């Protein structure tokens, strides 16, 4: 029987806020409120760098914009890098509102909603997009890179893409529970969130932009076979997907490699955000 009150603290869990702000990375900034389609009000920075093109960069479930290991890692590198951006907490999570996460599914609308903001306000600072995103924002990525067209290039690092294997995975990971529990909860999650399946090889036929797959030989939660038939799949139609495949954990080879990872990441942003 509690099998119940897990599925719904899988997809209410708790929030994570750091202290930090783009002022510790020597950057003014503004937080702003952003609303969703589905009225969702999200929390977020937008740090004005002086540029045309921003760059919005989107964490993994149970996290936030401040995650120590990754989020902070990567803003700082796009500051220096003079890109704008736009960092949001995703539903349910951080300081953004909503009661329930689904993991990839509706937070499709969370980043819908900061590309609307950002052609709202300030559209001549994001004459050009790019995402880029880890774990679940990384299933996100994958997704905005199809979908909105005002995005023209991603990065997904360690993207989830059996999506029912990384989340049976993800039991130990995220909560230390067994994986098998994963089917006994997983009908109760999707109860209470409205989260519902999606076809992430799909994407393989309808991603014709520049996207840049990140994948740890060392990920508990995806295989680098998975991705790399994501990849295989896509190069068909994508001249532009790239693979790296690294001796990482699961979203940590911004921390294990940072030079490696900067350093592959800065020249593909270079050659695509204009
Ligand atoms: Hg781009
Ligand atoms: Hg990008």
Redesign the pocket.
């Known amino acids: 029987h509690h099998h119940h009150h897990h599925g719904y603290k899988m997809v209410n869990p708790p929030r994570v806020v750091g202290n930090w702000t783009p002022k510790d990375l020597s950057f003014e900034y503004k937080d702003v409120e952003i609303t969703t389609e589905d009225n969702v009000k999200l929390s977020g920075w937008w740090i004005d760098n002086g540029s045309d093109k921003t ?1 919005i960069p989107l964490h993994g479930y149970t996290s936030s914009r401040w995650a120590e290991h990754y989020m902070r890692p990567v803003i700082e590198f796009l500051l220096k890098e003079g890109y704008n951006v736009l960092a949001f907490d995703f539903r349910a999570h951080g300081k953004s509102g909503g009661k329930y996460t689904t993991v990839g599914d509706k937070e499709i609308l969370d980043l819908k909603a900061g590309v609307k903001w950002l052609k709202d306000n300030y559209p001549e600072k994001s004459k050009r997009i ?3 995103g880890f774990s679940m924002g990384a299933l996100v990525a994958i997704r905005g890179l199809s979908e909105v067209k005002e995005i023209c ?3 997904a690092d360690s993207p989830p893409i059996y999506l029912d294997k990384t989340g049976a995975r993800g039991m130990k990971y995220f909560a230390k529970l067994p994986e098998w529990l994963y089917s006994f909860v997983k009908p109760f999650s999707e109860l209470f969130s409205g989260g519902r399946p999606i076809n992430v090889l799909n994407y393989t036929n309808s991603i014709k932009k520049p996207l ?1 797959l990140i994948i740890g030989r060392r990920d508990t939660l995806v295989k680098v076979e998975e991705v790399q038939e994501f990849y295989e799949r896509n190069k068909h139609v994508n001249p532009n997907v790239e693979l790296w495949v690294t001796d990482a954990p699961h979203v940590r080879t911004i921390q294990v490699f940072p030079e490696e990872w900067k350093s592959r990441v800065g020249e ?2 270079k050659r ?2 204009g």
């Open positions: 760059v790019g995402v880029i290039c991603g990065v840049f593909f942003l695509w955000m």
